[PDB]
């Protein structure tokens, strides 16, 4: 059904492929050519998960796991039973993720709005492809990619990390974590600021953006503004994911020893490298 204000916006057009063939809705959902492709890649993918669970011998959601090929398979294809399914599924998952993004472009065009959302979404699609495609290829085996299972994908995180000692010492991991931590701070403030102004003390009128800017200046001496906090939120979370892909593309490719040891370049700078005392020497 339709929101009270919605009919005036459901006009023909904005499609990228197909013209007016799939230009329609199903309940609230816009379909479009990439609505259909999403559904196709998604349903093909889910069928293959369930097949993988048949061969594995379990129907328990906390036990289904679809592993990549072994390392000795390098970058070739493996049999379905032993890593082939992961290969086909990974193709499907990508099919569905890009069709999702392209379908959002179409929704944007119909609505006359900017393309910022699919653009932001592509960065998450980037990160996924780093872990399942770009990193395995540079290393030379699909087996370095993570498995598709709820708890087993976590065991991969923990094993991969500890191959390099305390992964905390990856400098790109550090920056990535800062951006994640800051984005949440920023989000909490942005949410609290709007609500605190729309929902003032009992009996008082709605505050204004003047009150929002006054509050930040009184608090920290600077207010970034209402347009700028939205730029800030977009930028922080996009950078967070960017440096995540970065900390992972370099790990095991250009750097493969323990990450704590990478920091000896600083300590071993020649002008202070032998001054006694302190922690190092």
Ligand X SMILES: CC[C@H]1c2cc3[nH]c4c(c3C)C(=O)[C@H](C(=O)OC)c4c3nc(cc4[nH]c(cc(n2)[C@@H]1C)c(C(C)=O)c4C)[C@@H](C)[C@@H]3CCC(=O)OC/C=C(\C)CCC[C@H](C)CCC[C@H](C)CCCC(C)C
Ligand Y SMILES: CCCCCCCCCCCCCCCCCC(=O)OC[C@H](COP(=O)([O-])OCC(O)COP(=O)([O-])OC[C@@H](COC(=O)CCCCCCCCCCCCCCCCC)OC(=O)CCCCCCCCCCCCCCCCC)OC(=O)CCCCCCCCCCCCCCCCC
Ligand Z SMILES: CCCCCCCCCCCC[N+](C)(C)[O-]
Cα-atom radius of gyration of the chain, to the nearest Å? 25
**40 marked among binding-site residues:** no
- Check: CB of residue 13 under 8 Å from CB of residue 3: no
Pick the stretch among 8-16, 181-189, 221-229, 264-272 that binds ligand X (CB under 6 A): 181-189
b/e 47-77 (16+ beta carbons within 10 angstroms → b): ebbebbbeebeeeeeeebbbbbbeeebeeee
CB closer to ligand Z, 211 vs 231: 231
Contacts of 75 (CB under 8 A, 6+ apart): 136, 137, 140, 141, 142
Among positions 83-102, residues that touch ligand X (CB under 6 A) are: 89, 92-93, 96-97, 100
b/e 6-37 (16+ beta carbons within 10 angstroms → b): eeeeeeeebbeeeeeebbeeeeeebbbbbbeb
Pick the stretch among 23-31, 35-43, 54-62, 157-165 that binds ligand X (CB under 6 A): 35-43
221 binds, among ligand Y, ligand BCL, ligand Z, none (CB under 5 to 8 A by kind): ligand Z
Among 22, 34, 67, 97, binds ligand BCL (CB under 6 A): 97
CB closer to ligand X, 82 vs 153: 153
Among 33, 41, 142, 164, binds ligand X (CB under 6 A): 41
The least distance separating ligand BCL from the CB of residue 234, rounded to whole angstroms, comes to 16
Three-class DSSP category at 144: helix
Three-class DSSP category at 34: helix
State phi, psi for 249 to the nearest 5 degrees: -70, -35
Q: Give the tokens for residue 191.
A: 């949410």
- Check: CB of residue 167 under 8 Å from CB of residue 173: yes
The least distance separating other proteins from the CB of residue 18, rounded to whole angstroms, comes to 13
Residue 260 in contact with ligand BCL, rule: CB under 6 A = no
- Check: CB of residue 75 under 8 Å from CB of residue 142: yes
- Check: CB of residue 89 under 8 Å from CB of residue 66: yes
- Which residues share a beta bridge with 251? 255
The least distance separating ligand Y from the CB of residue 191, rounded to whole angstroms, comes to 8
CB closer to ligand Y, 72 vs 201: 201
CB closer to ligand X, 242 vs 262: 242
Counting residues that bind ligand X (by CB under 6 A) gives 30
Residue 181 in contact with ligand X, rule: CB under 6 A = yes
Among 24, 29, 115, 181, binds ligand BCL (CB under 6 A): 181
Q: Tell me which residues touch ligand BCL (CB under 6 A).
A: 46, 49, 97, 124-125, 127-128, 130-131, 146, 150, 153-154, 157-158, 160-162, 166-168, 173-174, 176-178, 180-182, 184-185, 241, 244-245, 247-248
Q: Which residue numbers belong to the known binding site for Fe cation?
A: 190, 230
């Amino acid at each position: 059904a339709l929101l009270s204000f919605e009919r005036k916006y459901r006009v023909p057009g904005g499609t990228l492929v197909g013209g007016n063939l799939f230009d329609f809705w199903v309940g609230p959902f816009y379909v479009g050519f990439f609505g259909v492709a999403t559904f196709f890649f998604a349903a093909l993918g889910i069928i293959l998960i369930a097949w993988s669970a048949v061969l594995q011998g379990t129907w328990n959601p906390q036990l289904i796991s679809v592993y990549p090929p072994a390392l000795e398979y390098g970058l070739g294809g493996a049999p379905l039973a032993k890593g082939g399914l992961w290969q086909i599924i990974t193709i499907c998952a990508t099919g569905a993720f890009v069709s999702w993004a392209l379908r959002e472009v179409e929704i944007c065009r119909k609505l006359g709005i900017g393309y910022h959302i699919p653009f932001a979404f592509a960065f998450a699609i980037l990160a996924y492809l780093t872990l399942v495609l770009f990193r395995p290829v540079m290393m030379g085996a699909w087996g370095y990619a993570f498995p598709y299972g709820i708890w087993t994908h976590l065991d991969w995180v923990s094993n991969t990390g500890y191959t390099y000692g305390n992964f905390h010492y990856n400098p790109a991991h550090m920056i990535a974590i800062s951006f994640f931590f800051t984005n949440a701070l920023a989000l909490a403030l942005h949410g609290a600021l709007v609500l605190s102004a729309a929902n003032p003390e009992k009996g008082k009128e709605m505050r204004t953006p003047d009150h929002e800017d006054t509050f930040f200046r009184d608090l920290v001496g600077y207010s970034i503004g209402t347009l700028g906090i939205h730029r800030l939120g977009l930028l922080l979370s996009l950078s967070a994911v960017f440096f995540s892909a970065l900390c992972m593309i370099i790990t095991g490719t250009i750097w493969f020893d323990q990450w704590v040891d990478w920091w000896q370049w600083w300590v071993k700078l020649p002008w202070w490298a032998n001054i006694p005392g302190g922690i190092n020497g």
